[PDB]
Amino acid sequence: LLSLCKIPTFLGNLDSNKKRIPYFSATNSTPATPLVTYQVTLSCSCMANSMLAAVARNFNQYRGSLNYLFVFTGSAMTKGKFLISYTPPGAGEPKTLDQAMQATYAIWDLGLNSSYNFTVPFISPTHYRQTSYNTPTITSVDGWLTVWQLTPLTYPLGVPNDSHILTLVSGGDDFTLRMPVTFTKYVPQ
Amino acid sequence: LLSLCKIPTFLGNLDSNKKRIPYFSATNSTPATPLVTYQVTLSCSCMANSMLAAVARNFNQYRGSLNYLFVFTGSAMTKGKFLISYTPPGAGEPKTLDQAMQATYAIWDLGLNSSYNFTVPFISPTHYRQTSYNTPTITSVDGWLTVWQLTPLTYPLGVPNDSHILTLVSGGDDFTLRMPVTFTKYVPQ
Amino acid sequence: LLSLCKIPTFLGNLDSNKKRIPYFSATNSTPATPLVTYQVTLSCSCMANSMLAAVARNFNQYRGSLNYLFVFTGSAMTKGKFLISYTPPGAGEPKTLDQAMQATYAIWDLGLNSSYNFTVPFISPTHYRQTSYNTPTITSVDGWLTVWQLTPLTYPLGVPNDSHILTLVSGGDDFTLRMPVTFTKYVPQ
Amino acid sequence: SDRVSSDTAGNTATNTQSTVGRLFGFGQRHKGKHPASCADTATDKVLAAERYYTIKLASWTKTQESFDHIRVPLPHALAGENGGVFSSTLRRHYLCKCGWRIQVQCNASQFHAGSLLVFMAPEFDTSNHSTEVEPRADTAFKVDANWQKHAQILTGHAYVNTTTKVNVPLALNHQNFWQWTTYPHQILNLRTNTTCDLEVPYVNVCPTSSWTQHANWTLVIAVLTPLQYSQGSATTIEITASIQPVKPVFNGLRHTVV
Amino acid sequence: SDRVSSDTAGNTATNTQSTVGRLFGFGQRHKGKHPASCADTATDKVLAAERYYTIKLASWTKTQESFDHIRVPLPHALAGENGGVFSSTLRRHYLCKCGWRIQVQCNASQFHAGSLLVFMAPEFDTSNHSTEVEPRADTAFKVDANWQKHAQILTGHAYVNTTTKVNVPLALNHQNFWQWTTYPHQILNLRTNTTCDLEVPYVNVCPTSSWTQHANWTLVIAVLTPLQYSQGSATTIEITASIQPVKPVFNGLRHTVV
Amino acid sequence: SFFYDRSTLSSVLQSTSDVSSKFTPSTAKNLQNSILLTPLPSDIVNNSVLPEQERWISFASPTTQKPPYKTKQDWNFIMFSPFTYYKCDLEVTLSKNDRETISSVVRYVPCGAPSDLSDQTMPQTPSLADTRDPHMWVVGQGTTNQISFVIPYTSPLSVLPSVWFNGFSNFDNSSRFGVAPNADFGRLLLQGQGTFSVHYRYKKMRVFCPRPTVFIPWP
């Protein structure tokens, strides 16, 4: 079943009308706040419908790397740089770019290659971490992944101001799950 | 000190308001006259503030190659070709492209690589040449370096008509200076 | 002459009437402030008449350990513990025992042996340090040596409340002076 | 004689002239190995943090009775500003793993009488017992400001009101002090020594500690025999301690706690 | 292609896709050797301090002229709270010795034109020049908030009133920017690269630095060719930098500076 | 090494007191009777007892707007010092400006050492010679009115700043920003009648970190 967990699947981002979409927007500006924020928990509502979460829901604990794949869908004429950061817990969510870049991060530069494969290192006080929880604990919630706009998306005339970046997740190369269980049942709709 | 002489430094070109700038302009046309003209003398007012000239001012004679570095700063969408010519003295300054291309020259084509490293060959009746002079002599003035527009700078819509080409100089690989001296003093301002 | 510098000689402490004495007092209490404070400079007025300073005055720079010898002269029935601290500069003089014990220190416990040989380690940004100065600089002033009362001097009835601790200084085992010079002359009195 | 002992740690050094040796709890020492539960390479061997932090603990008077005690929660006792670089590094890390090297000091005279029990205990209740209020982050891990009485802990102390206490015979934070001697310890007998030297390794329910939520070790000083002395003898008898975190290793670097 | 480069430092990593290589000033690197002028064993190999600290530097507009620049005093630019553990450790030490690994970032487009000179210079005047007032501790080592003009530094800038300035032809803080290219550098040509990578070793008048009094290194970003672009192209062009102290070693531990 | 290994005019000294007298710091039309050994500008700064290193050059005349300058320096060094730091030994040459038989005593004081501007300890003796510091004494019709000698680098600094020093020299940062502490080769105190010109020759010259030269007005 791990095979499935490693297949990058779509994250559910919120539309301006609170609708769920597989991408986020970026334009010619650099917000002082992150474009998107994903709490690293296989319980994140953000990855609720990814194959990774679908499988993880049937297991008690996980361990290993997580891969967050970002695919730039803007025009070929659009350029820009993002700073993808993974902030371990303990001091709360990063409030500024200064704080975000003080944790684990990678700068994603747009160009010929369309996507960036970002890995959230497995940094934990325990060897395994819970897949879900009632209330967040230090063994079920592991920080946040935020993507910032380092430089504004830049482009020439005749190009739409908004670019869409597809977002996906999956378990990394050394990712594993264990202890088969049944998740909290629900009524489909 | 030769190390310094080999570091490409900026030439002082004249602005439309007679102001000094580190570049010259080019556009969608091919003038019948050179875009810029530098007399090959380490005394040229044009290179007066380059490290090359600054060091040469403290020496009596030089010998060897001179490197004129041109860096295209126009847009990535702008194309064009320049004809950089070095005319040895004896028949005066070249008045037309026909005359310029009859001397030492290289055609610079714009594209992926941004700059062109042009070398003014050391062509002299004497083994060494004077760094400065009261009146120009055949041992202190060695001709001219002129850059012409072979083909007009060409580009699509939405691109500024004027492109700026940075201009720098330095001693070449086989360039040397000799005889330490003090240059004509002046009052800073 | 170094032989002389290594002979422990008396420091000049201030009497309650501002008179100079070779010792300081201690009693059945633990002050929140140091009993004595010596700035580590061979220029200290405190060691002005020690052989160490007398010799150092005729040299430009020193290097190496300094030995501060303390001799307990109280009764054999008197007990107690002192905390001798050497605080390197940069954050100013230590204001509390908490600050003093955060630097180099040794706890001196009274008993059979009467004296404690304390060494001020040579901690310096420079290999050598100035013997004197007009104004204190980072190459002429090296911090402070303060002695605190860790536990109160304790004793039985029939014993004077005040105990006298003799204080001496000298260069350590690896102490050296260099560059013979003449010190600022003065009129004896 | 052979009782003169000096111990160096970074830019600090303790000295005693009446030592009875150093007792190693569980005969173990914290070797400073990185926790296998963390993928990030730990920050360790920080010389500025591997030193002795000395603090005043309490005043011993004739009014203290056998088993009255003072508690020193660890690492919290040093998580404040006076914890130097150990503290500033600790506050900026999610996890910390370390042992403790400690020397408690207390002198009197050949004419004073009395003794103290100096020991280290894991999972030793450090919460406030002078209230029926639930312990909180800022009241659970504090160094005792006053001597703690002994009667109210034999059967524990439930955080419930006085009338309910009647139907609550035992609480899990109970401490049968008659056996406190089973914890790694030493005794500070005024006639014998003025210092006690202990050292314990790292123990906990897990590989490394989320210290912000847990004070796994507690240094405790309890009187065994009440202080006595005659008219004329020094009346001010104080207790001090030099605490050194042994080879602390930190994981999970983040912004500081407030 | 071969222009994609990633560089790791602690828990940080820079990435570029238009690198032209890394230039090592003086072909040297700070090896992290302890200063022979200090007897105390230095504090070093602090992973939490050996990382990249990223900060926004300035906005590049069409109004900037050749040689207008921004200065970044070192280590001071990172001596503030945002200097993380490098800062908190630095502030508590009398001396610090280190090199610098830096990457300045700035993107535009294939339709923009202009270039910057990114260089490191030792003993490069970082004092304020918009006044005749003597530089002070809190005004001498600050990262430029505004672009600095170029004319007022060719012959230096004396801290004397405007009328005296007339009889003062040259000041030792002069900077003949026509030769700024003799300093270890790289050029950020909008058509070529969006990043510059430099690294310099430790140089100074002495073995280690009493940093509180001296900013021996200065990162400088000067425009060589003015920014140009046509109507419709992105107008917001900003400059950033990732600064990493290379193997910093600290000596003279003490209480913090304020 | 070769370029800087030659004597260049770098200072001028003047004294109106005889050899056998007490040396007393004096100034006369911008000329002191003592010198600070440094190629950089030096002069009395804010009424200092002896010359200190300046941070800028000023004209001697308040009107002319033309040299001479009131500050002392090696013009050739200031106008051409394309480096940030330098290291070397100093060969000093001192020459009497006229042919009147010389009779002078010069005292050399190592970088940062005590100036010792004390009284004579014995009657009718040159106070400058009353020292163990290196000093020179030239006098008579057999002499050739000059003195030359070489001194080693004596500064406590590893290398000297050639142009600017971006910092203060004291711990309360109250000094004149831009001037490094003890950035010189010592001082020369002179007594005896006459005006003497001084030359510096940089022995085993070593330079570090290339930097801009002094700007020159556009022709």
PDB file of C-alpha atoms in Angstrom, chain D residues 31-248:
ATOM      1  CA  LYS D  31      27.261  10.237  27.245  1.00  0.00           C
ATOM      2  CA  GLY D  32      25.708  12.873  25.004  1.00  0.00           C
ATOM      3  CA  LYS D  33      24.487  10.523  22.280  1.00  0.00           C
ATOM      4  CA  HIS D  34      21.945  12.007  19.883  1.00  0.00           C
ATOM      5  CA  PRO D  35      18.337  10.821  20.303  1.00  0.00           C
ATOM      6  CA  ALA D  36      17.437   8.165  17.735  1.00  0.00           C
ATOM      7  CA  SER D  37      13.940   9.673  17.635  1.00  0.00           C
ATOM      8  CA  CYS D  38      15.149  12.790  15.798  1.00  0.00           C
ATOM      9  CA  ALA D  39      16.263  13.000  12.169  1.00  0.00           C
ATOM     10  CA  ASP D  40      17.784  16.472  12.440  1.00  0.00           C
ATOM     11  CA  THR D  41      21.412  16.408  13.558  1.00  0.00           C
ATOM     12  CA  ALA D  42      21.413  17.652  17.145  1.00  0.00           C
ATOM     13  CA  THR D  43      23.294  20.699  18.399  1.00  0.00           C
ATOM     14  CA  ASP D  44      25.773  19.557  21.039  1.00  0.00           C
ATOM     15  CA  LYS D  45      29.188  20.031  22.616  1.00  0.00           C
ATOM     16  CA  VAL D  46      28.366  23.673  23.363  1.00  0.00           C
ATOM     17  CA  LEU D  47      31.125  24.549  25.822  1.00  0.00           C
ATOM     18  CA  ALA D  48      29.293  27.707  26.928  1.00  0.00           C
ATOM     19  CA  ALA D  49      26.449  25.472  28.127  1.00  0.00           C
ATOM     20  CA  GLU D  50      28.486  22.681  29.710  1.00  0.00           C
ATOM     21  CA  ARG D  51      29.337  24.484  32.936  1.00  0.00           C
ATOM     22  CA  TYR D  52      28.231  24.909  36.544  1.00  0.00           C
ATOM     23  CA  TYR D  53      25.396  27.340  37.231  1.00  0.00           C
ATOM     24  CA  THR D  54      25.440  28.366  40.901  1.00  0.00           C
ATOM     25  CA  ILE D  55      22.353  29.608  42.751  1.00  0.00           C
ATOM     26  CA  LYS D  56      21.304  30.296  46.350  1.00  0.00           C
ATOM     27  CA  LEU D  57      18.625  27.860  47.525  1.00  0.00           C
ATOM     28  CA  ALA D  58      17.465  28.492  51.092  1.00  0.00           C
ATOM     29  CA  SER D  59      18.205  29.499  54.673  1.00  0.00           C
ATOM     30  CA  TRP D  60      18.315  26.714  57.227  1.00  0.00           C
ATOM     31  CA  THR D  61      16.881  27.622  60.634  1.00  0.00           C
ATOM     32  CA  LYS D  62      16.069  25.744  63.842  1.00  0.00           C
ATOM     33  CA  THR D  63      12.384  25.716  62.871  1.00  0.00           C
ATOM     34  CA  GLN D  64      12.796  23.188  60.037  1.00  0.00           C
ATOM     35  CA  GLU D  65      11.838  19.615  60.929  1.00  0.00           C
ATOM     36  CA  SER D  66      12.922  16.250  59.570  1.00  0.00           C
ATOM     37  CA  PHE D  67      11.793  15.863  55.962  1.00  0.00           C
ATOM     38  CA  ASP D  68      10.992  19.533  55.363  1.00  0.00           C
ATOM     39  CA  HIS D  69      12.448  20.155  51.915  1.00  0.00           C
ATOM     40  CA  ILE D  70      13.343  22.402  48.993  1.00  0.00           C
ATOM     41  CA  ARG D  71      12.760  21.262  45.404  1.00  0.00           C
ATOM     42  CA  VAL D  72      14.706  22.257  42.297  1.00  0.00           C
ATOM     43  CA  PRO D  73      12.902  21.282  39.047  1.00  0.00           C
ATOM     44  CA  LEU D  74      15.216  20.456  36.140  1.00  0.00           C
ATOM     45  CA  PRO D  75      15.943  21.708  33.534  1.00  0.00           C
ATOM     46  CA  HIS D  76      13.480  24.475  34.445  1.00  0.00           C
ATOM     47  CA  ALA D  77      15.457  25.747  37.431  1.00  0.00           C
ATOM     48  CA  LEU D  78      17.946  26.959  34.799  1.00  0.00           C
ATOM     49  CA  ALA D  79      15.569  27.851  31.960  1.00  0.00           C
ATOM     50  CA  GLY D  80      15.585  31.472  33.097  1.00  0.00           C
ATOM     51  CA  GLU D  81      18.015  34.236  32.177  1.00  0.00           C
ATOM     52  CA  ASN D  82      20.547  33.021  34.745  1.00  0.00           C
ATOM     53  CA  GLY D  83      20.793  29.784  32.776  1.00  0.00           C
ATOM     54  CA  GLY D  84      23.233  31.518  30.456  1.00  0.00           C
ATOM     55  CA  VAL D  85      23.816  29.889  27.081  1.00  0.00           C
ATOM     56  CA  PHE D  86      22.370  26.602  28.315  1.00  0.00           C
ATOM     57  CA  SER D  87      19.110  28.486  28.813  1.00  0.00           C
ATOM     58  CA  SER D  88      19.164  30.609  25.653  1.00  0.00           C
ATOM     59  CA  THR D  89      19.847  27.472  23.610  1.00  0.00           C
ATOM     60  CA  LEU D  90      17.257  25.411  25.473  1.00  0.00           C
ATOM     61  CA  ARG D  91      14.525  28.029  24.992  1.00  0.00           C
ATOM     62  CA  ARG D  92      15.098  27.898  21.239  1.00  0.00           C
ATOM     63  CA  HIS D  93      14.867  24.118  20.942  1.00  0.00           C
ATOM     64  CA  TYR D  94      11.860  21.830  20.999  1.00  0.00           C
ATOM     65  CA  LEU D  95      13.754  18.953  22.612  1.00  0.00           C
ATOM     66  CA  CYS D  96      16.593  18.559  25.110  1.00  0.00           C
ATOM     67  CA  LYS D  97      18.335  15.501  26.531  1.00  0.00           C
ATOM     68  CA  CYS D  98      20.905  15.728  29.330  1.00  0.00           C
ATOM     69  CA  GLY D  99      22.172  14.503  32.671  1.00  0.00           C
ATOM     70  CA  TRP D 100      23.100  16.478  35.779  1.00  0.00           C
ATOM     71  CA  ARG D 101      26.293  17.035  37.759  1.00  0.00           C
ATOM     72  CA  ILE D 102      25.466  18.761  41.025  1.00  0.00           C
ATOM     73  CA  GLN D 103      27.132  19.990  44.197  1.00  0.00           C
ATOM     74  CA  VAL D 104      25.052  21.480  47.001  1.00  0.00           C
ATOM     75  CA  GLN D 105      26.928  23.580  49.536  1.00  0.00           C
ATOM     76  CA  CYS D 106      26.241  24.356  53.194  1.00  0.00           C
ATOM     77  CA  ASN D 107      28.710  25.149  55.969  1.00  0.00           C
ATOM     78  CA  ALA D 108      28.272  25.642  59.720  1.00  0.00           C
ATOM     79  CA  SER D 109      30.871  24.756  62.357  1.00  0.00           C
ATOM     80  CA  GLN D 110      32.238  22.108  64.703  1.00  0.00           C
ATOM     81  CA  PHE D 111      29.735  23.443  67.237  1.00  0.00           C
ATOM     82  CA  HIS D 112      26.609  23.187  65.074  1.00  0.00           C
ATOM     83  CA  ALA D 113      24.554  20.006  64.686  1.00  0.00           C
ATOM     84  CA  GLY D 114      22.140  18.742  62.052  1.00  0.00           C
ATOM     85  CA  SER D 115      22.045  17.007  58.685  1.00  0.00           C
ATOM     86  CA  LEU D 116      20.477  17.238  55.242  1.00  0.00           C
ATOM     87  CA  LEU D 117      19.609  14.638  52.625  1.00  0.00           C
ATOM     88  CA  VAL D 118      20.634  15.695  49.129  1.00  0.00           C
ATOM     89  CA  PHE D 119      19.104  13.605  46.361  1.00  0.00           C
ATOM     90  CA  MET D 120      18.017  13.517  42.717  1.00  0.00           C
ATOM     91  CA  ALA D 121      14.666  11.981  41.794  1.00  0.00           C
ATOM     92  CA  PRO D 122      13.019  11.335  38.410  1.00  0.00           C
ATOM     93  CA  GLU D 123       9.321  12.192  38.052  1.00  0.00           C
ATOM     94  CA  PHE D 124       9.366  13.805  41.501  1.00  0.00           C
ATOM     95  CA  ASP D 125       6.293  16.028  41.980  1.00  0.00           C
ATOM     96  CA  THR D 126       7.335  19.693  41.881  1.00  0.00           C
ATOM     97  CA  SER D 127       3.822  21.175  41.838  1.00  0.00           C
ATOM     98  CA  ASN D 128       2.573  23.642  44.448  1.00  0.00           C
ATOM     99  CA  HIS D 129       0.836  21.971  47.398  1.00  0.00           C
ATOM    100  CA  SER D 130      -0.309  25.037  49.308  1.00  0.00           C
ATOM    101  CA  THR D 131      -3.457  25.160  47.137  1.00  0.00           C
ATOM    102  CA  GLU D 132      -6.201  23.003  45.670  1.00  0.00           C
ATOM    103  CA  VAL D 133      -5.689  24.736  42.330  1.00  0.00           C
ATOM    104  CA  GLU D 134      -4.614  22.835  39.215  1.00  0.00           C
ATOM    105  CA  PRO D 135      -0.876  23.235  38.532  1.00  0.00           C
ATOM    106  CA  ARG D 136      -0.120  25.480  35.550  1.00  0.00           C
ATOM    107  CA  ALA D 137       2.849  26.073  33.254  1.00  0.00           C
ATOM    108  CA  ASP D 138       4.089  28.937  35.451  1.00  0.00           C
ATOM    109  CA  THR D 139       3.530  27.315  38.852  1.00  0.00           C
ATOM    110  CA  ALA D 140       4.453  23.666  38.293  1.00  0.00           C
ATOM    111  CA  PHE D 141       8.183  23.907  37.565  1.00  0.00           C
ATOM    112  CA  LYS D 142       9.452  26.526  40.015  1.00  0.00           C
ATOM    113  CA  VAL D 143      12.280  26.274  42.522  1.00  0.00           C
ATOM    114  CA  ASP D 144      10.733  26.286  46.000  1.00  0.00           C
ATOM    115  CA  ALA D 145      10.897  29.728  47.601  1.00  0.00           C
ATOM    116  CA  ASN D 146      10.014  28.371  51.049  1.00  0.00           C
ATOM    117  CA  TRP D 147      10.705  25.113  52.853  1.00  0.00           C
ATOM    118  CA  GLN D 148       7.990  22.560  52.134  1.00  0.00           C
ATOM    119  CA  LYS D 149       6.387  20.781  55.074  1.00  0.00           C
ATOM    120  CA  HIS D 150       6.328  16.984  54.971  1.00  0.00           C
ATOM    121  CA  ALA D 151       2.997  15.714  56.311  1.00  0.00           C
ATOM    122  CA  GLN D 152       0.918  16.738  53.269  1.00  0.00           C
ATOM    123  CA  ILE D 153       2.773  14.489  50.802  1.00  0.00           C
ATOM    124  CA  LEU D 154       2.993  11.074  52.459  1.00  0.00           C
ATOM    125  CA  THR D 155      -0.275  10.074  50.793  1.00  0.00           C
ATOM    126  CA  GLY D 156      -0.027  12.636  48.027  1.00  0.00           C
ATOM    127  CA  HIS D 157      -1.863  15.872  47.364  1.00  0.00           C
ATOM    128  CA  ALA D 158      -5.022  15.949  45.243  1.00  0.00           C
ATOM    129  CA  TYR D 159      -5.850  19.241  43.506  1.00  0.00           C
ATOM    130  CA  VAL D 160      -9.363  19.190  44.930  1.00  0.00           C
ATOM    131  CA  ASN D 161     -11.052  21.283  47.632  1.00  0.00           C
ATOM    132  CA  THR D 162     -10.565  20.512  51.323  1.00  0.00           C
ATOM    133  CA  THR D 163     -13.951  18.797  51.788  1.00  0.00           C
ATOM    134  CA  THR D 164     -13.443  16.350  48.896  1.00  0.00           C
ATOM    135  CA  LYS D 165      -9.944  15.601  50.205  1.00  0.00           C
ATOM    136  CA  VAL D 166     -11.715  13.508  52.854  1.00  0.00           C
ATOM    137  CA  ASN D 167     -12.819  10.884  50.332  1.00  0.00           C
ATOM    138  CA  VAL D 168      -9.440  10.873  48.560  1.00  0.00           C
ATOM    139  CA  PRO D 169      -7.052   8.606  50.535  1.00  0.00           C
ATOM    140  CA  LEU D 170      -4.197   8.518  48.003  1.00  0.00           C
ATOM    141  CA  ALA D 171      -2.812  10.633  45.146  1.00  0.00           C
ATOM    142  CA  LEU D 172      -0.200   9.491  42.600  1.00  0.00           C
ATOM    143  CA  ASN D 173       2.111  12.337  43.617  1.00  0.00           C
ATOM    144  CA  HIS D 174       2.679  10.657  46.973  1.00  0.00           C
ATOM    145  CA  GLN D 175       6.188  10.573  48.428  1.00  0.00           C
ATOM    146  CA  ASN D 176       6.993   8.221  51.299  1.00  0.00           C
ATOM    147  CA  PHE D 177       9.951  10.286  52.520  1.00  0.00           C
ATOM    148  CA  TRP D 178      10.946   7.519  54.928  1.00  0.00           C
ATOM    149  CA  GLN D 179      12.446   5.883  51.838  1.00  0.00           C
ATOM    150  CA  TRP D 180      13.774   9.018  50.093  1.00  0.00           C
ATOM    151  CA  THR D 181      17.133   7.453  50.712  1.00  0.00           C
ATOM    152  CA  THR D 182      16.447   4.962  47.893  1.00  0.00           C
ATOM    153  CA  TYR D 183      16.991   7.818  45.417  1.00  0.00           C
ATOM    154  CA  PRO D 184      20.570   8.537  44.327  1.00  0.00           C
ATOM    155  CA  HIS D 185      21.774  10.702  47.199  1.00  0.00           C
ATOM    156  CA  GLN D 186      24.331  11.806  49.747  1.00  0.00           C
ATOM    157  CA  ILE D 187      24.037  13.277  53.229  1.00  0.00           C
ATOM    158  CA  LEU D 188      25.314  16.666  54.331  1.00  0.00           C
ATOM    159  CA  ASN D 189      26.225  16.093  57.976  1.00  0.00           C
ATOM    160  CA  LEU D 190      27.441  19.370  59.501  1.00  0.00           C
ATOM    161  CA  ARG D 191      30.092  17.556  61.540  1.00  0.00           C
ATOM    162  CA  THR D 192      31.428  15.774  58.433  1.00  0.00           C
ATOM    163  CA  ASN D 193      31.013  17.657  55.143  1.00  0.00           C
ATOM    164  CA  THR D 194      29.970  21.049  53.759  1.00  0.00           C
ATOM    165  CA  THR D 195      29.275  19.714  50.265  1.00  0.00           C
ATOM    166  CA  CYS D 196      27.567  16.827  48.492  1.00  0.00           C
ATOM    167  CA  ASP D 197      28.410  15.732  44.962  1.00  0.00           C
ATOM    168  CA  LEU D 198      25.935  13.883  42.770  1.00  0.00           C
ATOM    169  CA  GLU D 199      25.507  13.054  39.101  1.00  0.00           C
ATOM    170  CA  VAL D 200      22.652  11.337  37.301  1.00  0.00           C
ATOM    171  CA  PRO D 201      22.209  10.234  33.680  1.00  0.00           C
ATOM    172  CA  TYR D 202      19.252  10.994  31.447  1.00  0.00           C
ATOM    173  CA  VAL D 203      16.080   9.033  32.194  1.00  0.00           C
ATOM    174  CA  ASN D 204      12.576   9.697  30.884  1.00  0.00           C
ATOM    175  CA  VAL D 205       9.551   8.041  29.293  1.00  0.00           C
ATOM    176  CA  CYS D 206      11.133   8.761  25.893  1.00  0.00           C
ATOM    177  CA  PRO D 207      14.495   9.252  23.995  1.00  0.00           C
ATOM    178  CA  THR D 208      14.552  13.033  24.396  1.00  0.00           C
ATOM    179  CA  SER D 209      12.386  15.547  26.244  1.00  0.00           C
ATOM    180  CA  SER D 210       9.860  18.162  25.185  1.00  0.00           C
ATOM    181  CA  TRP D 211      11.094  20.077  28.239  1.00  0.00           C
ATOM    182  CA  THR D 212       8.449  22.804  27.942  1.00  0.00           C
ATOM    183  CA  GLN D 213       5.933  20.243  29.245  1.00  0.00           C
ATOM    184  CA  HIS D 214       8.102  18.132  31.517  1.00  0.00           C
ATOM    185  CA  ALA D 215      10.612  18.469  34.366  1.00  0.00           C
ATOM    186  CA  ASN D 216      11.894  14.880  34.476  1.00  0.00           C
ATOM    187  CA  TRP D 217      14.529  15.448  37.169  1.00  0.00           C
ATOM    188  CA  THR D 218      14.238  17.117  40.562  1.00  0.00           C
ATOM    189  CA  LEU D 219      17.054  18.030  42.941  1.00  0.00           C
ATOM    190  CA  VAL D 220      15.790  17.818  46.520  1.00  0.00           C
ATOM    191  CA  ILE D 221      17.343  19.012  49.782  1.00  0.00           C
ATOM    192  CA  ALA D 222      15.542  17.721  52.875  1.00  0.00           C
ATOM    193  CA  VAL D 223      16.616  18.054  56.491  1.00  0.00           C
ATOM    194  CA  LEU D 224      17.150  14.731  58.265  1.00  0.00           C
ATOM    195  CA  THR D 225      18.211  16.095  61.626  1.00  0.00           C
ATOM    196  CA  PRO D 226      17.125  19.614  62.723  1.00  0.00           C
ATOM    197  CA  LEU D 227      19.678  22.419  62.940  1.00  0.00           C
ATOM    198  CA  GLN D 228      21.005  23.053  66.453  1.00  0.00           C
ATOM    199  CA  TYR D 229      23.496  25.481  67.971  1.00  0.00           C
ATOM    200  CA  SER D 230      24.085  27.390  71.196  1.00  0.00           C
ATOM    201  CA  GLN D 231      23.911  31.103  71.997  1.00  0.00           C
ATOM    202  CA  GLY D 232      26.848  32.842  70.350  1.00  0.00           C
ATOM    203  CA  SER D 233      27.291  30.574  67.341  1.00  0.00           C
ATOM    204  CA  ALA D 234      26.620  31.891  63.832  1.00  0.00           C
ATOM    205  CA  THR D 235      22.858  31.962  63.249  1.00  0.00           C
ATOM    206  CA  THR D 236      22.811  32.427  59.474  1.00  0.00           C
ATOM    207  CA  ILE D 237      23.150  29.002  57.838  1.00  0.00           C
ATOM    208  CA  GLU D 238      22.464  29.002  54.098  1.00  0.00           C
ATOM    209  CA  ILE D 239      22.264  26.335  51.385  1.00  0.00           C
ATOM    210  CA  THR D 240      23.616  26.765  47.852  1.00  0.00           C
ATOM    211  CA  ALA D 241      24.009  24.609  44.744  1.00  0.00           C
ATOM    212  CA  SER D 242      26.142  24.390  41.608  1.00  0.00           C
ATOM    213  CA  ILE D 243      24.196  22.719  38.806  1.00  0.00           C
ATOM    214  CA  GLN D 244      25.784  21.507  35.588  1.00  0.00           C
ATOM    215  CA  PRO D 245      23.841  20.055  32.658  1.00  0.00           C
ATOM    216  CA  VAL D 246      25.903  17.049  31.523  1.00  0.00           C
ATOM    217  CA  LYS D 247      26.553  16.960  27.762  1.00  0.00           C
ATOM    218  CA  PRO D 248      23.165  18.415  26.784  1.00  0.00           C
TER     219      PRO D 248
END
